[PDB]
């Protein structure tokens, strides 16, 4: 029930409402309204903060507003005091040159680790955090691994007499921007979805 | 029916003749292609006698003048076929029981095939 009220509260102020026909909902809040709105979101009854998922869209085929985008996942547990079960995502775009975003540690302690992880994997600093300390990558590692401008750093596979493989030039798989080995891709290899 | 079996057997027999001619006139013979249902059969069991489906007699320039083919194992309207390239000439043989290998109603014996291949050699072969 509270999700419908979220949608009605957001639509009045001009917030885009994203929806796929699969049962997943997005409400994109600007960064100004982000903090206060999500504070209100906790006040609206969001006990549980599932995820903080950061996204780097450098190599995405279509352009996006900003390079980085951080998505928080808000839920209300059905089995607690008054449990509805309404779960949804909030996306907030973060510039390449402005990896700033207020923490919800004060709101949810759940983001204590989660936000740290995104500072490790992305260059995104979450302002007001108790400790933004590199979690996963070694202390002497330079950079942020999950952003697309950071190499995966593969090593060649080894064989008997000088026969070696460099997997990046061995992949028959394509990416979204990879043109393929023929003049073009259309049809199924431009995006494919069955009509149930 | 079961005539199919002997047909493939007869088909194998046909190949022999071809090879013999290669030694006779000193002309190049080549195995063109083998059965797909024998390459790509992975575990599936295979009872057919030979593995070769298409072969040809090529001249000194390598360009074929005589082609012979047999129908695959699971296809409809099975036959054995002969073709003279560039000459718009097609022959379609069956195997009739008691008679033998016949082109339609007319028997296809060794002598007939030898004459046909010799005519192709004298006429069509460039070098």
């Amino acid at each position: 029930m509270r999700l419908e009220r979220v949608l009605e509260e957001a639509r009045a102020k001009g917030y885009p409402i994203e929806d796929n026909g699969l049962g997943n909902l997005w409400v994109v809040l600007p960064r100004e309204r982000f903090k206060e709105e999500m504070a209100h979101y906790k006040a609206m009854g969001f006990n549980f903060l599932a995820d903080i998922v950061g996204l780097d869209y450098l190599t995405y085929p279509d352009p996006r507003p900003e390079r980085f985008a951080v998505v928080y996942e808000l839920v209300s547990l059905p089995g607690w005091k008054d449990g509805d079960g309404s779960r949804f995502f909030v996306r907030v775009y973060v510039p390449e040159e402005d990896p700033r975003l207020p923490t919800v540690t004060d709101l949810w302690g759940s983001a204590n680790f989660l936000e740290r992880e995104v500072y490790d994997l992305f260059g995104i600093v979450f302002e007001g955090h108790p400790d933004l300390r590199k979690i996963l990558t070694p202390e002497d590692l330079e950079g942020h691994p999950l952003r697309k401008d950071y190499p995966l750093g593969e090593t060649p596979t080894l064989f008997r007499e000088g026969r070696y493989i460099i997997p990046a030039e061995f992949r028959a798989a394509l990416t979204g921007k990879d043109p393929g080995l023929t003049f073009y891709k259309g049809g199924s290899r431009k995006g494919y979805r069955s009509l149930w | 029916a079961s005539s199919e079996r002997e047909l493939y057997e007869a088909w194998v027999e046909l190949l022999s003749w071809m090879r013999e001619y290669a030694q006779a006139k000193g002309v190049r013979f080549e195995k063109e292609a083998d059965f797909p249902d024998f390459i790509y059969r992975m575990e599936r069991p295979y009872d057919l006698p030979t593995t070769i489906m298409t072969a040809s007699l090529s001249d000194g320039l390598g360009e074929p003048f005589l082609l012979a083919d047999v129908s695959p194992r699971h296809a409809k309207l099975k036959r054995i076929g002969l073709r003279l390239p560039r000459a718009h000439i097609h022959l379609h043989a069956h195997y009739e029981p008691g008679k033998g290998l016949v082109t339609g109603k007319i028997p296809l014996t060794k002598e007939r095939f030898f004459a046909l291949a010799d005519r192709a050699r004298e006429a069509l072969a460039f070098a």
């Binding site: 002497d140 330079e142 190499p151 750093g153 593969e154 090593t155 060649p156 | -």
Partner: protein, 127 residues
Amino acid sequence: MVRVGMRAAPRVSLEALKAALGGLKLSEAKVYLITDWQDKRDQARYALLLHTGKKDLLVPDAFGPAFPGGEEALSELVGLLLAQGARRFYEAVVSPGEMTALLDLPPEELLKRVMAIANPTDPGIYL
């Protein structure tokens, strides 16, 4: 980032590195001995990339037993780096073609790639 030494001249590369290293303290430096083919060290060749954080140093492929006087030169080199107080030694395995071009990429990409692919190594394998 500076480049000293010359390819396939182990003693020249080693003496030039002796001169250029000087009194630089390597307590926080990163030593990248770049090679190919993880297993076979008896014929191995090595480049070197030393990242102090303040400035970097590049030695081309002139070290390893693959060259005359190369094994003793790599032993002297790793002993020198350990003497100057380094603890962090790294080995990157690149394709043969990468060894050549990687020293000709711009400094930022070469350094980022080496740092991303480097494996912690025991200097005992080079001593």
